[PDB]
């Protein structure tokens, strides 16, 4: 039912990398998907540009706050994914790069 442009519900970690490293996508291209790791958790996948590897995809676990909430680092939590994505879009604040455009398909 009408997901966000960056929400790829059932996309695996491997295809997330494959999709983000594909043409049309660039630095800061990202998506959020169900985590391969934990119950009801989600993971952030982001394409980043470095010196040695060139184009690469970095994956972050998005933790759940008991009874509601999300955070990547304990020093700043968010009531929802929209808040989390807006936050990291305007500031990397610890992340590898600022979130730019959702993965384009």
């Amino acid at each position: 039912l009408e997901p966000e442009p960056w929400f790829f519900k059932n996309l695996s970690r491997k295809d997330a990398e494959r999709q983000l490293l594909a043409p049309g996508n660039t630095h800061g291209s990202f998506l959020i998907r169900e985590s391969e790791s934990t119950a009801g958790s989600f993971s952030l996948s982001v394409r980043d540009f470095d010196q040695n590897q060139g184009e690469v995809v970095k994956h972050y676990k998005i933790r759940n706050l008991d009874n509601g909430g999300f955070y990547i680092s304990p020093r700043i939590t968010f009531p929802g994914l929209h808040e989390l994505v807006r936050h990291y879009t305007n500031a990397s604040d610890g992340l590898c790069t600022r979130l730019s455009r959702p993965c384009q398909t």
Partner: peptide, 4 residues
């Protein structure tokens, strides 16, 4: 998994 990358971390902040």
């Amino acid at each position: 998994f990358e971390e902040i």
